[PDB]
């Protein structure tokens, strides 16, 4: 129970910290531009579009990395658990070689 609660707290704090770090423009309403302001309009679009793309990256890759960050983490925990037990049973156990 203890170790799995620690792991769940780690995952929850990870996603929560990501959430807190993301705090950007709130009122992203759409401005309007006249026919002779086309340049400006394009600029706006590009600017806005660029940000979306960046954040898409900054989101997608994040969870991508984080997914690996989590998966092996879980594996790591198990090894530690095994190691811990193996290191608490110095010479009283036949290390059955499948993890037992």
């Amino acid at each position, epitope marked *: 129970k203890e170790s*799995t609660q620690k792991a*769940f707290d780690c995952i929850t704090n990870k996603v929560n910290s990501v959430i807190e770090k993301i705090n950007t423009q709130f009122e992203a309403v759409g401005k309007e531009f006249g026919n002779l302001e086309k340049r400006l309009e394009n600029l706006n679009k590009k600017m806005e579009d660029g940000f979306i793309d960046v954040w898409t990256y900054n989101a997608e890759l994040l969870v991508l990395m984080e997914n690996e960050r989590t998966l092996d983490f879980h594996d790591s925990n198990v090894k530690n658990l095994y190691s811990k037990v193996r290191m608490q049973l110095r010479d009283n156990v036949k290390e059955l070689g499948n993890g037992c």
Partner: nanobody
Amino acid sequence: EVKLVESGGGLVQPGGSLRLSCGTSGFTLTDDYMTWVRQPPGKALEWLGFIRDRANGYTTEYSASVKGRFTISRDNSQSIVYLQMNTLRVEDSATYYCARPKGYFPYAMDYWGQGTSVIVCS
């Protein structure tokens, strides 16, 4: 830091019906073991029932006393869960708490709302 809000209870005639609801604020990694519990003003806290998430079917586990009386289900589209009061009795008078274990597994009913009192006086 998720705040569980709830509403619905009040003064009800015996044998009536009521729409209890508890809804969830904040970012919950899972809302799997959604649970309804009650505490009569006599301080004999008693567990009522479950409701789970998509992953394993919106199944329920009611208390034996309340196998068919109350009905728990969620309308997931707005992240709220309803409990229906039917066939009310005098004993049903209690402050009802929404509760929920944080982990994917049941280790502690560790998120409780302010509770809503329901009062069936004879």
